Every structure is written in C-alpha cells, then in structure tokens.
Amino acid sequence: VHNDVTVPDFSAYRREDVMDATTSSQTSSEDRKGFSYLVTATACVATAY
Amino acid sequence: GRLMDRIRKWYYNAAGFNKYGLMRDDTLYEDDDVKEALKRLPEDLYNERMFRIKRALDLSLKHRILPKEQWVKYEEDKPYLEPYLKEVIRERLEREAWNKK
Amino acid sequence: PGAEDLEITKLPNGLIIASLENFSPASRIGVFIKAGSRYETTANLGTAHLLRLASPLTTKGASSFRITRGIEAVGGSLSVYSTREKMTYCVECLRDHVDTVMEYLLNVTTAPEFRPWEVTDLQPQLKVDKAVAFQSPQVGVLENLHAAAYKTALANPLYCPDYRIGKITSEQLHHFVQNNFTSARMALVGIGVKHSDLKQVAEQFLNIRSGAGTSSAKATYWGGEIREQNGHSLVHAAVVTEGAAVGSAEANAFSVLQHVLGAGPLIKRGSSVTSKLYQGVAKATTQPFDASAFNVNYSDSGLFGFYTISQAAHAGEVIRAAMNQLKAAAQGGVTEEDVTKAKNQLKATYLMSVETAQGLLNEIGSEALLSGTHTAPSVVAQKIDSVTSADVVNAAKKFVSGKKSMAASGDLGSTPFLDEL
Amino acid sequence: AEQFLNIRSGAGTSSAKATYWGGEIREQNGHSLVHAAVVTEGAAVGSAEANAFSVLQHVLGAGPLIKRGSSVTSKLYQGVAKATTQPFDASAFNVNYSDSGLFGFYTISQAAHAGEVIRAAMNQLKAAAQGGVTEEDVTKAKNQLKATYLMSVETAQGLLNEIGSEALLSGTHTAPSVVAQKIDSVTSADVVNAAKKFVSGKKSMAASGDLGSTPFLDEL
Amino acid sequence: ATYAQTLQNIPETNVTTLDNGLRVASEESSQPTCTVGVWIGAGSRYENEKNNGAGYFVEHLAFKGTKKRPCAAFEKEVESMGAHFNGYTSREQTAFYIKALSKDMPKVVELLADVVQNCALEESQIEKERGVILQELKEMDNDMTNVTFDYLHATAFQGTALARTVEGTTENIKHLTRADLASYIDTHFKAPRMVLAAAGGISHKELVDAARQHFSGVSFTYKEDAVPILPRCRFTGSEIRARDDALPVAHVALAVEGPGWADPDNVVLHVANAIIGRYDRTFGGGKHLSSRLAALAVEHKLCHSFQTFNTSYSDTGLFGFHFVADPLSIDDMMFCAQGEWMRLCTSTTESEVKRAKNHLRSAMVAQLDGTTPVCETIGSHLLNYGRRISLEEWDSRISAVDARMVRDVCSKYIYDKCPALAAVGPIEQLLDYNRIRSGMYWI
Amino acid sequence: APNIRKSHPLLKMINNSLIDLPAPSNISAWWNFGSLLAVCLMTQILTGLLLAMH
Amino acid sequence: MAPNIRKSHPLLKMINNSLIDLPAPSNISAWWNFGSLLAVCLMTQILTGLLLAMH
Ligand code: HEM
Ligand code: HEM
C-alpha cells in the first residue's frame, strides 16, 4: 500500500544548506537561487557582449 | 413621411441577393455573434437556410440567377435570424459590462 | 435576544410563509414545493430530474450568466434538493445580502424561460449527474426498490431513465412547472430573516396562480422483486412492506421499531449492541456486513423493512438472519426497556437533525408545507414516547404478514428470492 | 469420429435442475410498440404432454400461413383482432427443454392498446380451458403440425438438425410416421387439459416498451 | 439585525484551566442537544519510525472499552442514551467527541475522561484491530485523492516527520505492541496538551465542574506539564510520480510551503484560494462561474474537478491545488492552474478580492453549522492559537484584505518558488519538473 | 492508412493542399491569380538563374 | 480553441512540436548534438556567404 512508500535519501546530491532535515529550507532559498540565476545572468551578459 | 420604405425597398432590390433566392439574413457575414445565433435556430429554419445557401452557391458557380418569378419580394423577406442575433449581442454586452464592473 | 418566535402566515392564495429569526449571521431561504418524479407519467419520465438541473438557466428576470455571477458576487449559493414527491430550492448567504440573492431564488422558481437551446445543451448533463449518483450501489437498489414496491407514481425513478436523456422538451418543463409549481403547493420558508420581511416578499413577488394543478395518481402497491446481477463482491439487498404514510400514529410505531431493530451506527467502528437486527446478523455470519432497519414515509404511503450489504457467498444467511429478527420481534420478542431506549435515540436523532441550518430549514418547511403549521419539539417528543410496546410489536407483525417487495444487486448467486424468505 | 475424437468420455459437469420462479420483468424503454409474453411451466422434451401443447399451440395460433393474410384458424389472433382496431400480433408461445418447458402467448401491440390486447389473449386461453375447443379444431391443428414438421426438414440445415437433435437425446431416430402417429393420437381432452394447466399454473411475464398501459401479471 | 450586530451578539467562548494543565472551553447556546469532546495535540508527526501508526491504532481501541467498563458495557451505555461517539487522528491533531443531550453533558465528560485515561487496550482486541486496520489500508489505497495527498507530504516533507502518513506503515501495524500503544497514550494524552471543548446548551461552570471531578491526575515534575516543541520539518521542492496507465483518471497535486497556524498571512492565502476557488463536473454554474480556472475547465474540459487548499500546521503548511483529469488534458489543466497562480501574485483585482472575501466569510460561518462543527473550532483554536477567535475577529481581518495585499502575500509564498508535486495514475502527459518549475514565474 | 496519398508524410502534404483540398464550388476567375502568382515566382526564379549564369 | 497559443497558433504550433514539446529520448548522448550543429553551420555559412557575395 502507498503507506509503505517513502522518498529515498538525496543527501549525496543536496546542496549543503538543505542537507539538514530539521532546518527550514526557505532561509537558504534566496541564496540558492541567487547563485544559479547569477550564473545565468552572467552567461547572458557574455552572450550579449 | 415614408421615406425609408422608399429607400429601403430600392436598396433591397438594388442589392440583388433576392435574385439568388436569399433572404437578407442569409447573407450576413458569420462573425462570432452570428455563428452563435445560428446555433439557436430551430431545426427546420436551419435546414431551410442551408438549402437556400447551397442553392445560391450552385447558382453562383453556374453564373445564372433565379427566374424573376422566384426572386424573394422585399415585403416577403423573412428576418428569421435578427431576433436571435439581437439576444446574442445583448447577452454579450451584459457579460462585457459586467466583467468590467 | 435568542428568544424569537417562529411565525408562519398563510396568504389567501394558499401560499404558506414560515420564518424564524435566530440572529445567525447567515440566512437560508427556501421554496418548498410538492413536486417530483411522482407526478410524472410514462410520457414525461425524468422531466423532474432535468428540471432540478435547469435551476441555472435564464429566466425572464435574470440571465443564466447573472444568476451565477450574481449569487457568487456575494458569497452566496443556490441549490435544489428533491425526493420523489418534493422539491426544495434554497439559497444561503450572509444576512446583508438576502435582498440580492432573493431576486434569483424568485426568478428561478417562478419565471423560468427554458430556452430550447439552453435545454438541449443541458440534457447531456443528465448522464453525468446520474453516473456519479450511481457510484453508490445504495442509489441503484432504492430505484429498483420503488419500482418493485409500486406500479405507479412512487414507482417512478428519481433519476431520468436513459432512453429519455435528450428527449425531454422545453414544453414538458414548462407544463411541469405550470401544473405543479402552484401557490397552493408551494411554501416560502426562511431562517435568519424576519417574518414581516419574508412575508412581504411573498405577497409582492410570488405569482404563478394557485390551485393544485394536475393531481398525482394514487400509489398502488405491487410487491415486486427486481434483481440486478452485476457481479459486485458486495450484495446490497432491501426487503420491505407497505408501511405508514406521512402523518400517522402508525408512523411513530415504525420509527421506534426502526430504532429498536437498528437504525445506523452510533459508535465509530463500534458494534451496535442496541441493534436487534445487526446483532442477529452478526451471530449468523463471520464476514463483514451491514444490516439496518429501512423506513420511508410518503404522503399517501410508505415503505418499511431492512437493508443489508454482505459478501456474495454469505448473502443468503445474512438476509435470512435479518428476517428472523423481524419475526422474533413480531412475536413479542421486544423488551419494554428496548422500547424505552429506542425512544431516546429517536428523540435524540430528531433533536440533532436540526442543529444545522439545512436541517432546521428542512424541518420547518417540510411541515409548514404539508399542514401550514409547526409542532412544538415537545409535542413531537410527547407523541413519540407515547407509543406502547404493543404498537411496536404490531408494526413488526404488519411486516411479517404484509406482501413484500424486494430489490438486490451484485453477485446474486447466493441471494434468496422473496418466496424463500 | 473414433480415429480422431480424443477429448474423452464422461458426462462432464451436469447442469443444475431448472427451478420455476414465475417472476415478472418489465422494461420501460418508451417504444411505440409493446412486446409482451405470458407463460407457464409447459412440457419438457419428450414429455408425453408435449404434443398436447404443440397441438394447443397450433389451435391457438402458431404464426401466419398467408402473406398479409389474416389467420382465421387462429383462435388467439382472431380473438385479439376482435378486441383492438390497431395493428398487432399474437401467437402461442411454446418451448421444450430437457427438464422443463414454457408455454403461453407472445403479443406485440401499440402501447395504448396493449392492455386490451393482452387481456384478449388471456380470455382465449381460458375460453379454451373451458372446453371451448372444437373436435375439428384439433383435427386442423394436427395437420398444420404434421405439415410444419414435414416442411422443417426440406432444407439441409433443418434435416441435419432434426437427425442430430434426436440422435443426441436418445441415440435413435423416430420414423416420420411414428411421429405423425404420436401427434394425431392426441385427444381433444388432452388439449383442453394443456389449456387448463396454463390458466391454473403460476405464470411468469416479461414486457418491454412504453408499458404505461401494460397490465401486471396479477391483473390478468 | 445586521451581519455586524449578529457577529457581536454571539455568545463568547469561556475558557478555564485546571491545575493539571488541562483547558476547558465551551460556547453556550439554548440547544437541548450538544457536543463535547477532548481535542488532543497529538498525531503521526509526534510518532517516529518505530511507532508510526500507533496514534491510529489507539484511535481504534479508544472505543472498544475502558478498565471501569469493558466493551459491551461501554457501548451499551453510550448507545442506550442516544449519544454518538466519533473521533479522528491526523498529523498534528487528534480528537474524541460525543454528540448528546445537554442533559447528559456531565455523564459524557466522565465517559470522555475514562476513554482518554483508562483505555482497556484489551490484548485480544489489539490483534483483532490489527487485521481491521490492515483492511482499511487497502481500502484507502484506492482513494487516489488521499494517496495523492499522502505522497504530497511524503515528498514535500521528505526526510522529516510530516512525511509519514497518519495510518502508519504495514510493518508497524503488523508489530505494534500492547506496550507501544500504552506508551503512546501515556506519552501524549496529557492534560496540558488536551482541550475539553463543548458547545450547545451547557453550563460552562457545570462543564468545568465535572471536568475537575474526572480530569484529575495532576503531574509532579516539570517535564510532565511542559508542552514539547516539535523539531522543524524541512520543505523540499520536489516530485513523486506514481504511474499506472491502468487507472482511469490522473490526480495531480502541487504545493509550496505554507506559513503555519499563528501567521496572519493565512487570512490572505484563504482569500486568494477563494479567488481560484474549486470546481467539479456537477457545478450547475458551468461556464459562468466566477473562478476563471473553473470557467476554463468548463470551456476546455480540462478536468473532472479541482480544488485549492491551505493546509496549516504549527510551524509550516501546504498551500496548493489538486485536480483530477483525463490522461489527455493534464498538461492544459496544469498550464491554466499555474497560470492562475501567476495571476494572483501579479494581477489580482479589487473586484476579485471583494468576491473572494464574501465567499470566505460565508465559508467560515459554515464551519460553525452545528454543535460538532463549532466544538471542533474551539478545540482546534485553543490547540493552535491558544485561544478562540470570534467570527467578528476573522471578519475584522478579512475586511482589511485588498488586491495589493493578496498580490504581495501570494508573491511571497508562490512566485518563483520550487513546488512539491505528486502525480498518480496515467500521468505521461504531465511535463517534467523543470517545465513545471518555469510555470512559477512571469504571468 | 490504406492509401499512400494520405499516409506518406510528404504526399500527405500534397494531397491536403492540391488534391483533396476542400474548395468552394463557386469561386470565379478572380481566384485564379493565386496560382498564377505562384507560377510567376517559379518562372522568374528559373529564368533569373539562367540569366545570373552569364 | 486551445487555452495556450504555443499550441493553437498555426506557426508556433510548428515551433512547439519540433523544438519545445517535442518528445526526446532521455538518454541521447553528445553524438546526437551534431544535427543541431549541422543546422547552425548551415545558417552560419549562408550568412557569411551572402556577406562575402556582396563584394
Ligand atoms: C520575384 C522574381 C523576380 C523578379 C520580380 C525579378 C525582376 C527583375 C527585373 C525588374 C529585372 C530587370 C530586367 C531588365 O533588364 O530590364 C531583373 C534582372 C535580373 N534578374 Fe530578376 N527577378 C526575379 C527573380 C530573379 C532570380 C531568382 C534571379 C537569379 C537567381 C534573378 C536574376 C536576375 C538577373 C541576373 C538579372 C540581370 C539581367 C537582366 O537585366 O536581364 N532574378 N530581374
Ligand atoms: C553550405 C554552405 C556553404 C558551403 C559549404 C560553402 C563553402 C565555400 C567554400 C569551400 C568556399 C571557398 C573558400 C575559400 O576562399 O577558400 C566558398 C566561397 C564562397 N562562398 Fe560559400 N559556402 C556555402 C554557402 C554560401 C552562400 C549561401 C553564399 C552566398 C549567398 C556563399 C558565397 C560564397 C562566396 C561569395 C565565396 C567567395 C569568396 C571566398 O572565396 O571567400 N557561400 N564557399
């Protein structure tokens, strides 16, 4: 039955800031996205250039 | 004074859709409002309109018109869709007005 | 000021008006009517079902569009409930919007236009509405039950038969409304409103002349048996007999016998000990099951018996066991304390039934419709407990001796026929 | 057969005995025409009482013999005809199974006249149960029966079916003379009895159409 | 009598605390009938890997008899008085309540206390319910909507406590011990974490009196009267896809992390959800429904039904939507659904909120339609807000909400967030996470 | 599909635009200039290439 | 007809069905990159070629 289903462990892949299950993941969200989007924004700059 | 009747009867005859056996309403461009109205027409009125149109297209392709005795007469032209179409437009305007409200 | 009166005027044309201020922040008005599949004849079967769904169509005063947008504009709601013999159109909304919502309730019940195209478009909905309803086997057997219990009127199905989906006409909808939605068959009941206000609305807006319009044919008992072999692991069965009708000292007898036999669970996942019927079936079968005392009261008739649900293989024993509990009861096997307990559950039930706005309003209007009056919750209790142990045992006998009608669906391979009970 | 047929011997699983119910099923489907059938446990295959019903069948009316023509030799048809003005059809129904059989009549009528048409068909059965059967009626029916049977075997499909049917339920073959010998050797009494067995026996009914005017088995 | 006046004239909710830490609250009316029960701040979230499904297992025995009165006796007594005994267990909240005649409020209170304190936990009943529960798990496994919400929590809160289901695991149910259930009860069913609530025709002082008489067993140490704060459950933008093309329709649920009970923003989220609303193929309203998504659903036959939600908890929550659609219309549905969410954050109208607010008011008023629903509010309110919140306060808060507020709050919890997704059934047409993630911005 | 004119991914296109294409039964000579314009285009390109080669 | 232009518009419909919603195998490797590179050389060659052709 579905009750016996659980999401596996993604620790071998999680970003450092969301590794701990007892910590809100929202506090590091803006950084996690800021970084990724920073790369994208920079690629757009190099491309525009 | 009855000036319109003079003019509207002249125009009707000048227009000439009646030479194909078409009613005024048979010639309306099918925009959204008209399309909706047509769906509300009773079966027979619908099937009748269809025949008149198919027949006219056959006339148009043949490059002929109907014998003068079959031309619809200004005063016998049936405004079969106008009532429906008006309700349709009214409803639409109501929704429109209301959606700004 | 939680001590308001339950007024109840009654205009000259026969329209009954019952109101009641409870100062609740929400008002729930309704238009009760004596209409239903009961008044349909072969020719217009299902027309009452479609009419139930046609509540949102355009009227002479409001368009389909405004009826929905209007009511929603003020967090209001509009619904229509119906039985084989009564249709209720009620609207709920916050106090300060009763005027708003009312226009719509009015237009829907008195000024429908049943435009041909809107009707044609709506009919396919009957399939959908019906398909979801029939997901509960309960509904299917009850339909067949009334078809086996009667030859007419009440025998008519509550959901439009399939061969007629798409065939009902605007004419039929109009004629039904004209010949049934008459001021003398209607009732404007309301809660969270002031009688003077509701009373005013009625006399000023409700039109559609009085009269009893076409009267329904009398309900003739058949005592038939319909079996639907559909293969389901569970078998639903109902066995009944003609019981008391609405308004009867006999009614109360069956109600009590109902609660004495077993009228539904009271403890979550708990067994029902105070249930003669359940306890009996339980002793007979080891597998999951469910037995209950069935009971319906209509204007000119009623049905009484038991409804079971069991695994296919044990249907036989489960149904017979339920039968013995009825005989055993007809033969004085009813304690005097049993009748005492049942009377509590009955008084309690009734009392709880009115906790919700939907329940209170339905109780008021139902009575305010079949007798333009209102029995005090004390007179009703006074009438119920004043039911001897004899009465009950008699009700039980009337069942064992009366001609029975039955309906069952599922893998009926082990389900007994009415003549083996 | 012998050198090829291998799925072997035994009587295999035997069927359960046929238990009579005498129920009533009504399908309200709105059709302009109402088909209805009323029957009673009839005779079984090989049951001596079979020929009796066969003859009573032909005496009441077992199908048309004249194209677009009326059936005068049909007690049942003629009776219904007298009752209704509209198009209809009535016939004596009859089935013979291994351990049971069914006998009665099948009608087809406009919805509004179903009531009278069905009742009319019933009276023709009572009226027959009450000696209302001529000795000549039984003579004529015996011809139609002998004839029918004899024609049935004209086509390869019919001949083969006749042979095999019997060659299966008794590994034998009755001479077309013994079958005729058995049929006409059926008294006028027998027939009237068959007719009685119907009027007294518990009946089962089935009807479909706009049953608004179709009567229930307990009103017949 | 105006809506306002009616809101102010509603009897106040009385609260009084006993020395043992239990809280007794009730709202008085003039009804011969009433509902009373104890709302416990317990549930699956309080369980762990070894005792998951205990609180549920307990919920099954809480009605099979106490020490003072075995099964049959317990049942007969309640049945014979026409009282109704129901209850439930969830992730953060449990409840056992009785519907009865105000005339019995006191006997009931005694019964409640006896249930929560002296459950017989019959050794033989335990093995019996063990099989019943196992059957209920197979029954619920066919309830797509609930399988979908379980999965939604399983991934949205993966690795944590809210990830577990209320009913528990198959292994737990097969091995939970009489001692485990006992331990559960003693550990969680405790005075300071419970609330005796009642509504109907009852004397607050009579209620609290019977309360003092039966809810005694005070605590000695400090560890016994302190309400344990639970460890935070981490939210995770992710998805779980359980595919079975053999299923007739597909269920999809998408959600972002919610604020949690105490946060005022919840009033705004509920208004927001009110704009999008909900729908199902039997809403006569049809193509004229105010909810844009509902309108599109009808016009394009996008789904069989859909619904928004703002599930709260102590420190977190799930704000999202769920729909049921044919395998071939999932993509357009998800497209429009996400589209509307974008509209919320970006182009909400004053008209939109005006309506949503009315809708919300009548919705809160509806959740107080009877003694049980009102009693539920009280229990939940004290247990979550540590105090009852009048309809007048709610209405006060609801009234302050405007389009701009909806946009900022919605932008706050929705815009450019990584959602949690659960898809069950014939879900091939549902595009990947990255595609969905992009529907989270611009709209 | 039973006949290639409809199944083949390329013919399918020719069929839906120059063979089974539904056309009004009454269009006149004024509807001939579309195809004529197409032919001018093909003609111009062909003669233009030939000229461009010198 | 359709709720979103990416699918109803007769031109976008084409871009969507070949470069946006086009179903692709999840495991194709770098060897499946040369198709698009070939397309880009083609557009690149044409562009530079016209530019050269103009002188
Ligand atoms: C839309 C189709 C075309 C139009 C309307 C068009 C029109 C013209 C015009 C106005 C001239 C001048 C004729 C004159 O000498 O008086 C011209 C010249 C020329 N065209 Fe085109 N042309 C078309 C397509 C082409 C194509 C596709 C090519 C080559 C691949 C081409 C190659 C030439 C060349 C080489 C000349 C110069 C020789 C000459 O003047 O006769 N043309 N074209
Ligand atoms: C499939 C794309 C093409 C290929 C493979 C290609 C290849 C070549 C090659 C091998 C050369 C000689 C380069 C050299 O000078 O050593 C050349 C020359 C040239 N190509 Fe292309 N070409 C392509 C398309 C075009 C197009 C579209 C045009 C013009 C509209 C064009 C115009 C020229 C011109 C004018 C030259 C002469 C100038 C030069 O040699 O650099 N090419 N091309």
PDB file of N, CA and C in Angstrom, chain C residues 4 76 80 152 190:
ATOM      1  N   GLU C   4     -36.756  34.406  19.926  1.00  0.00           N
ATOM      2  CA  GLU C   4     -37.621  34.898  18.855  1.00  0.00           C
ATOM      3  C   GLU C   4     -38.725  33.878  18.568  1.00  0.00           C
ATOM      4  N   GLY C  76     -22.768  33.905  -2.044  1.00  0.00           N
ATOM      5  CA  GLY C  76     -23.975  33.117  -1.862  1.00  0.00           C
ATOM      6  C   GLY C  76     -23.944  31.780  -2.589  1.00  0.00           C
ATOM      7  N   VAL C  80     -30.718  22.832  -5.262  1.00  0.00           N
ATOM      8  CA  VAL C  80     -32.054  22.285  -5.358  1.00  0.00           C
ATOM      9  C   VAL C  80     -32.052  20.825  -4.941  1.00  0.00           C
ATOM     10  N   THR C 152     -47.140   2.523  -9.802  1.00  0.00           N
ATOM     11  CA  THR C 152     -47.219   3.885 -10.304  1.00  0.00           C
ATOM     12  C   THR C 152     -46.685   4.944  -9.343  1.00  0.00           C
ATOM     13  N   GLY C 190     -37.947  30.449   5.580  1.00  0.00           N
ATOM     14  CA  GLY C 190     -36.676  31.140   5.726  1.00  0.00           C
ATOM     15  C   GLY C 190     -36.129  31.193   7.137  1.00  0.00           C
TER      16      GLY C 190
END
